[PDB]
From a paper:
RdRp of IAV is highly conserved among influenza viruses. It is composed of three subunits–the polymerase acidic protein (PA) with endonuclease activity, the polymerase basic protein 1 (PB1) with polymerase activity and the polymerase basic protein 2 (PB2) containing five-prime cap binding site (CBS). Host five-prime cap binds to the PB2 cap-binding site, then PA cleaves 10–13 nucleotides from the host five-prime cap and PB1 synthesizes viral RNA. One potent inhibitor of the cap-snatching process, pimodivir (VX-787, JNJ-63623872), is a cyclohexyl carboxylic acid analogue inhibitor of host five-prime cap binding to the PB2 subunit. We have crystallized proteins of PB2 wild-type (PB2-WT) and selected mutated forms PB2-H357N, PB2-F404Y and PB2-M431I in complex with pimodivir and obtained four high resolution structures.
Almost every mutated variant occurred only once, but the M431I mutation was found in four volunteer-samples. In this case, 57-fold decrease in sensitivity to pimodivir was measured. The examination of M431I substitution revealed a 12.5-fold reduction in replication compared to the wild-type virus. Compared to WT, the M431I mutant had minor difference in the thermodynamic parameters of pimodivir binding. The inhibitor bound to this mutant with less favorable en-thalpy changes of 0.5 kcal.mol−1 and less favorable entropic contribution of 0.6 kcal.mol−1. The RMDS of main chain atoms, Cß and Cγ for PB2-M431I is 0.12 Å and for PB2-H357N is 0.09 Å. The M431I mutation had only a small impact on the “free” energy of the water molecules. W1 and W4 molecules become even more favorable and the other become less favorable (mainly W4, W6, and W10), which resulted in a decrease of the stabilization energy in the pimodivir:PB2-M431I complex. Pimodivir had comparable binding affinity to WT and M431I variants of PB2 in such a model.
Residue numbers in the entry: 322 to 483
Amino acid sequence: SFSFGGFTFKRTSGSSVKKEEEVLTGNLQTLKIRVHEGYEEFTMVGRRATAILRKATRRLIQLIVSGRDEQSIAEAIIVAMVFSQEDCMIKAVRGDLNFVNRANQRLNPIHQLLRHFQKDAKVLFQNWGIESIDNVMGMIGILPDMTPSTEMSLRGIRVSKM
Ligand SMILES: O=C(O)[C@H]1[C@H]2CC[C@H](CC2)[C@@H]1Nc1nc(-c2c[nH]c3ncc(F)cc23)ncc1F
């Protein structure tokens, strides 16, 4: 239904209304983003990874991911975290004031966030948060360093891997 970061997104459930909101990045730039308000589920289909995303307003509730290799799974996770519009993803932006240009009639801020994190997702992964996980057979944790764990995971994130 739409393409974002190389994944085909389809909404499978729920609805949202869009409210324009100014947000402040970690490096103190202002982005004016269309915040989606409501409960939604999406599928994400890539060449090398597939995910199920459950989200609410600026909140990743669950992401289940399967993929070819560590790189392919990290790609899905980064796109999902930007799509979530979470405040910790907005605050993970650091470094050059790259969102200040204004040359184009309109420069999509969610695309700007994804392009930022495609350069380096270390700050994003390190600030997202980790949680203890239940023992669900075939579901493993993935740590900020993209290492598997049976005990902990990035908040809301599980890899489907036997
Ligand atoms: O807002 C936009 O300009 C585009 C770009 C940035 C993310 C989506 C894909 C590209 C967005 N397009 C669409 N988003 C959504 C959408 C629903 N809930 C969401 N929550 C967060 C989010 F972020 C986008 C959405 N629905 C239909 C779309 F067609």
